[PDB]
């Protein structure tokens, strides 16, 4: 309580400082005295204050004799040397139920006023207690907002008992392959990016696995395309094991887990002219030589689908092509207006699967079209005509690639065309 230990808050800052108390550096401080309920000041902590406050210092102890609760006293001679008082309390002894209630009761009765202390670790001796408990005891007890606060050890091995005790145990990985465990400080954790899967983490709970975001993860999602969501998609999906298998002159990825709606796709794409941009014609090329993890778990997380969910085969044919080079230019037959068109075409009225068509905005119609550059093109739509070139069919919850002569992958039944491929000849 003397007025001159007081200081405003400010964000509390413990330090745990090495060697012994005539060290400190002090500043009008409470220095803390470990004691017994006769003041002896036998040894440790205690007889190096008392050694240190002077003679009268002891007298005075004696004077007021047994202690049941805390005491405050003048620091007497340990004045010269920036200590404003002592403070005493009895430790509980470490042999008995419950110790880290009572050492939790002793931090919580030493900081109560906005000063700067100086505390001797509690439990000290062969009578003592787990520096680990007392250093954790302390952490529950102590505020936030009473600034610099200083422990003391000579042990050398408490300011790594202590830099655990503030240190939450993380399992990250960049990669869903190899997976790092690592011991982060709550500023770490924010500089570690932890991601959910969904959102960033800032207490991440234990034993799981968390996305670190790091700039290599970012280029690499932006290099696929994907946000983070979708990229955690993707990598966890490389882990599935899948068959492809060269069949009808293309490589195709055996029927499983409702994958078809991805085979549609890639066997359509495989039987145009498209060639896939730099980053996925890499992926492309793993598949077509029997790595199809990687392209298959991009193609998954592109369309927000997973691994035995069933999906869209329009989304996939249009996911690939809009990846590659594929782009036109042509001519409506309507009023000969000259247009470029990239991607595949979403003819979402007047869908012919043997007559490609745009929409015209000057007329407002589906009109066909003459080709004046590009190899061909995709058009997407739902009709049930039958097509004469390499087609997509969708009927009863399966779709398949067909060519246009029967030339199927599936059934030969009547279905819906869904996609069809228009070379330029
Ligand atoms: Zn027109």
Redesign the pocket.
């Known amino acids: 309580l003397p007025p001159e230990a007081i200081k405003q808050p400010s964000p509390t800052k413990v330090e745990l400082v090495v060697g012994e108390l005539a060290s400190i550096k002090f500043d009008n401080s409470v220095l803390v005295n470990p004691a017994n309920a006769q003041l002896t000041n036998g040894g440790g902590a205690a007889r190096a204050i008392a050694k240190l406050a002077g003679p009268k210092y002891q007298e005075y102890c004696n004077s007021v004799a047994p202690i049941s609760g805390p005491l405050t006293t003048d620091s007497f001679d340990a004045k010269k040397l920036g200590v404003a008082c002592i403070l005493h309390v009895v430790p509980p002894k470490g042999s008995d139920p419950n110790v880290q209630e009572l050492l939790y009761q002793a931090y919580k009765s030493i900081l109560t006023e906005p000063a700067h202390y100086v505390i001797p670790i509690l439990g000290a001796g062969i009578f003592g207690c787990n520096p680990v408990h007392s250093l954790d005891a302390f952490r529950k007890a102590c505020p936030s907002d009473i600034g610099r606060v200083t422990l003391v050890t000579m042990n050398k091995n408490h300011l790594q008992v202590w830099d655990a005790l503030n240190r939450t145990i993380v399992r990250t990985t960049t990669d869903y392959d190899q997976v790092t465990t690592k011991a982060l400080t709550p500023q770490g954790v924010l500089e570690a990016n932890l991601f959910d899967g969904e959102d960033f983490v800032q207490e991440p709970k234990p034993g799981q696995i968390y996305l670190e975001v790091t700039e290599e993860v970012q280029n690499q999602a932006k290099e696929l395309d994907l946000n983070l969501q979708q990229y955690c998609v993707y990598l966890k999906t490389c882990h599935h094991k899948w068959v492809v298998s060269r069949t009808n002159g293309l490589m195709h990825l055996k029927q499983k887990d409702n994958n078809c709606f991805v085979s549609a796709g890639v066997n359509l794409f495989q039987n145009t002219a498209y060639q896939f941009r730099p980053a996925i014609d890499a992926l492309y090329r793993e598949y077509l030589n029997g790595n199809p993890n990687r392209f298959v778990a991009w193609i998954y997380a592109s369309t927000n689908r997973r691994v035995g969910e069933m999906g869209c085969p329009q989304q996939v044919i249009s996911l690939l092509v809009s990846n590659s080079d594929a782009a036109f230019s042509a001519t409506?037959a309507?009023?000969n207006?000259y247009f470029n068109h990239t991607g595949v075409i979403s003819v979402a009225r007047e869908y012919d699967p043997i007559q490609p068509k745009v929409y015209?905005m000057?007329?407002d119609?589906w009109?066909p079209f003459t080709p004046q550059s590009g190899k061909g093109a995709v058009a997407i739509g739902t009709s049930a005509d039958e097509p004469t070139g390499p087609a997509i069919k969708f009927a009863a919850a399966h779709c398949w690639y067909t060519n246009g002569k029967k030339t199927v992958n599936g059934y030969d039944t009547k279905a819906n065309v869904v996609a069809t491929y228009h070379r330029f000849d």
Do not use: F, L, N
Request: hydrophobic share 10%.
């Open positions: 409506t309507c009023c207006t015209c000057k007329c119609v009109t």
